[PDB]
Amino acid sequence: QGVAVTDVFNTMQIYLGSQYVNDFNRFGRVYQVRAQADAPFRANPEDIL
Amino acid sequence: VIRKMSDTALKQPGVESAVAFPGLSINGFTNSSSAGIVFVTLKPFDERKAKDLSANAIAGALNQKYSAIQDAYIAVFPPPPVMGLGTMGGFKLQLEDRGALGYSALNDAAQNFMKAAQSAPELGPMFSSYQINVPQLNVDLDRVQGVAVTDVFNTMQIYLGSQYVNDFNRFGRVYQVRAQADAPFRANPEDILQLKTRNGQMVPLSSLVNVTQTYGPEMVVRYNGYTSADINGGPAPGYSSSQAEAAVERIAAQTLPRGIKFEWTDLTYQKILAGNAGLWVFPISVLLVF
Amino acid sequence: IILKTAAVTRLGDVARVELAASQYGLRSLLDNKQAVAIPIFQAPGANALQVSDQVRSTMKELSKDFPSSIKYDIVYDPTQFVRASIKAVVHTLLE
Amino acid sequence: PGANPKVIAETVASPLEESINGVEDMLYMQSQANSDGNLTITVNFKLGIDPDKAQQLVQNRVSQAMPRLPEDVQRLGVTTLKSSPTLTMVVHLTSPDNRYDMTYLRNYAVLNVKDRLARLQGVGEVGLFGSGDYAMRVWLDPQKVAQR
Amino acid sequence: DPDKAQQLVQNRVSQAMPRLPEDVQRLGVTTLKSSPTLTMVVHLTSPDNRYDMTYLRNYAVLNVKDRLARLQGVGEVGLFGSGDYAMRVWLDPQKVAQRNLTATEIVNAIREQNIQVAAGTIGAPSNSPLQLSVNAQGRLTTEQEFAD
Ligand SMILES: CCCCCCCCCCCCO[C@@H]1O[C@H](CO)[C@@H](O[C@H]2O[C@H](CO)[C@@H](O)[C@H](O)[C@H]2O)[C@H](O)[C@H]1O
């Protein structure tokens, strides 16, 4: 197939792990924005498949 | 205006020289486009031996001559006794919002505080520097053709604002290369509507953004992490400075709404922190001598 | 600099390049004459008159290499006051 | 450069203020944001503290908050310095013939005078008030750019 | 003296910072001395179970830590809770794949619509009687704006 190792690694890192993207402001202070998969979709080892 | 003022001042018999800084503000020694400072240095002490050549007479005559400009607000001040120190006769404090209410709420609180202070005794005139009356432009973009927000913001960033690209070498040292629009092409509020952007086709911003005129501040002062406004004052004649702080605290206990606090800043803060702890030295010395 | 090739489009006919200042917003004048100002501060725990005398001497030394239309000037020196005070003190003692 | 006072007050000054506070023996901090896009934060210490230790602590604290700042600010860079209150003299440099402008005079003072006037014994610091240093300025015409 | 050791450690780690991966250096690393002596512990509870751990910890950060830190003699103040605030997005891979969409494209898209804008002034070397600043809409603040 035409898939790349970087593609699957990035998808696995973003979904199963975490990814800190940009910042925002609230209550006069700076906070973070993070991306992660929903909990019920990452509860079993078969979910990776 | 500063040139005319210096020309007028350089004819006084007592003065020696005048240095001018058109574009410098006295509030924090920052840069402002609608303010100016002139230092006037006098003749040596030997020549100005007459009574009418004293500093106060020079200041009075200069103020009287300046009061006929009809173009700006002009004030004359004497030098401070010690450089780097704050005012030692009056006092200053900060009104700051713990809850991060906004600018309008802080301005209303400041006006209410000034009204309450002017309605109360044991206080003289009070000054402030908080201003929200500076005009400005506000541009809004709607989400209604293949154009991207990033491009329509980058064009405005690079044309109206300055962009720093690369470096170069000359005279042995290193300097910068900057890009900006020509002066005649950005001197009007309607010039923002004449820029163009890509997508492949050329399209102007006349069908993308709208511009309106609004009001706001010019300089932002932040004290201890929160936005704050400065309040200057002094004790009323006939009373000491001890009761002035008590009166200020008493009136602030009521005139300040929720989420607004006040704090001493200079000199008075150190006097309160040190406290009355050096009053034992005279009894100690008397006992030692006895 | 060549930007787009089609006919060649250069930087000269699209924009105007020049050498200028990197920051505008502050102007300094002395008697309505364009000039520059430089004040000198001391380090803590130093001498007052020695640094002043060295400054005058080195400015006089550098004045020889200045171009035709460039000159320097002394405007303000607040080290004079102590210069007076000590002087007065001595007189009192003598008297 | 090119920033609005609210933008520089929120995006730039807030992380620096949130990181800097906490060092020993402070009284207060002040931050000023100006319309032209300049931010100045001054922090004072209690009497008796050696300036070198305070400068070192401030440097250590500011070095931690650099990655959170915007790309333009990082590329330009921020600078820190201890303040010297006492003044001993001021000197002006003039062009009586009106042959040289402000920027050339300022850069001439920078090139050779300041370096020799900074190496004497007892000098804390010297400033320079006037126009900026040299730069290659390109002024663009949007009409010609859009034409091509 | 702890100050010299902290300065040496900071000077050493600042040299080795560039070799670290992008994520850790973009998040940042911290260094600080250790105070072995503890004087008091204080808790701050919600009897009615109206507030969870996160809000309570953030409130303690916002309104309690700053006042306690400025006290005289305090070395450091700790905090053991659930963490500071953050804007969390939870993705559903099935719906993402339904739209022929990938996660990296989503991350790129969210990163480009939540940036602040810097706009130059109007009539700043110009010959206009007035100079007016320009501002636009930058960072988002509410959850609805993020969802839109
Ligand atoms: C020839 C070169 C000389 C170099 C001199 C060194 C620079 C000295 C800078 C002095 C700074 C200004 O110093 C001090 O500023 C404050 C703050 O505005 C002035 O304080 C002023 O406040 C406001 C206006 O702002 C007035 O309503 C008030 O009546 C007046 O006191 C003082 O009158 C002045 O003594």
- Indicate the SS3 state at residue D50: coil
Angle at B114 between CA B218 and CA B63, to 5 degrees: 70
Q: Give the Cα separation of D1 and D9 in Å (integer).
A: 13
Q: Are E96 and B99 in contact (CB under 8 A)?
A: no
| CA of E128 vs chain A CAs: smallest distance (Å) | 36
Please give the radius of gyration of chain E, using alpha carbons only, rounded to the nearest integer.
Answer: 23
| Run of H or E residues at D81 | none
Q: Give the Cα separation of C43 and B148 in Å (integer).
A: 55
Chain length of chain C: 95
Nearest-CB residue to A14 (from E23, E107, E111): E107
Q: Give the Cα separation of A35 and A15 in Å (integer).
A: 8
Written as six digits, the tokens of D140 are: 């663009």
Q: Are B98 and B224 in contact (CB under 8 A)?
A: no
Q: Are B6 and C32 in contact (CB under 8 A)?
A: yes
Angle at E135 between CA E129 and CA E136, to 5 degrees: 145
Q: Are B160 and B192 in contact (CB under 8 A)?
A: yes
Nearest chain B residue to A29 by CA: give it: B225
Nearest chain A residue to D6 by CA: give it: A28
Q: Render chain B in DSSP notation, one character per residue.
A: -HHHHHHHHTT-SSEEEEEEEEEE-SSSS-EEEEEEEEEEEE--TTT--SGGGSHHHHHHHHHHHHTT-SSS-----PPPSSTT---SSSEEEEEEETT---HHHHHHHHHHHHHHHHTSSSB---EE-----EEEEEEEE-------HHHHHHHHHHHTS-EEEEEEEETTEEEEEEEEE-GGGGSSGGGGGG-EEE---EEEGGGTEEEEEEEE-S-EEEETTEEEEEEEE-BPTTS-SHHHHHHHHHHHHHHS-TTEEEEE-SSHHHHHHH-S-STTHHHHHHHHH-
Alpha helices for chain A (secondary structure H)? 5-12
Q: Do E3 and D53 touch (CB under 8 A)?
A: yes
Specify the pairing of strand B173-181 against strand D134-140: parallel
Angle at B163 between CA D41 and CA B189, to 5 degrees: 95
Among the listed residues B158, B154, B160, the one whose alpha carbon sits nearest the alpha carbon of residue B137:
B160
Q: Give the Cα separation of D141 and C14 in Å (integer).
A: 7
Method by which the coordinates were obtained? cryo-EM
Cα torsion D14, D15, D18, D23 to 10°: value is -120
Written as six digits, the tokens of B135 are: 């005009």
- How far does the centroid of ligand 1 lie from the alpha carbon of residue D139, in Å? 39
Q: Is the CB of B39 within 6 Å of ligand 1? A: yes
Written as six digits, the tokens of D31 are: 């931050």
Nearest-CB residue to C25 (from B2, B7, B31): B31
**Residue C45: C-alpha distances to residues B232, C48, D11, D25, D48 (Å):** 34, 10, 40, 22, 13
Resolution in A: 3.1
Q: Give the Cα separation of C75 and C30 in Å (integer).
A: 10
Phi, psi of E62 (to 5 degrees): -70, -40
Task: Report CA torsion sign: D8, D12, D18, D20.
Answer: negative
Q: Whose CA is nearest to atom 31 of ligand 1?
A: B77
Residue to mutate, B25, B74, B77, B267, ligand 1, most ligand atoms under 8 Å from C-beta = B77
- How far does the centroid of ligand 1 lie from the alpha carbon of residue B80, in Å? 7
Phi, psi of E9 (to 5 degrees): -65, -40
Angle at A13 between CA A7 and CA A15, to 5 degrees: 100
Q: Give the Cα separation of E126 and E93 in Å (integer).
A: 55
- Indicate the SS3 state at residue A44: coil
Who contacts B36 (Cβ-Cβ below 8 Å, separation ≥6)? B1, B2, B20, B21, B22, B23, B24
| Contact status of E147 with chain A (Cβ, < 8 Å) | no
Q: Is the CB of B26 within 6 Å of ligand 1? A: yes
Within 10 Å of residue E143's Cβ, how many Cβ atoms? 9
Q: Do D142 and B194 touch (CB under 8 A)?
A: yes
Ligand 1 atom with minimal separation from the B129 CA: 25
Q: Is the CB of C20 within 6 Å of ligand 1? A: no
Q: Give the Cα separation of B78 and B63 in Å (integer).
A: 12
Q: What is the DSSP letter of A4?
A: -
Q: What is the DSSP letter of D23?
A: -
Residue to mutate, B16, B17, B19, B26, ligand 1, most ligand atoms under 8 Å from C-beta = B26
Q: Give the Cα separation of A12 and B68 in Å (integer).
A: 76
Q: Give the Cα separation of A35 and A17 in Å (integer).
A: 9
End-to-end CA distance of chain C: 80
What HEC string does chain E produce? CHHHHHHHHHHHHHHHHHHCCHHHHHHCCCCCCCCCCCCCCCCCCCCCCCCCHHHHHHHHHHHCHHHHHCCCCCCCCCCCCCCCCEEEEEECHHHHHHCCCCHHHHHHHHHHCCCCCCCCCECCCCCCCCCECEECCCCCCCHHHHHC
Residue carrying structure tokens 């404090």: B93
Specify the pairing of strand B226-233 against strand B31-42: unpaired
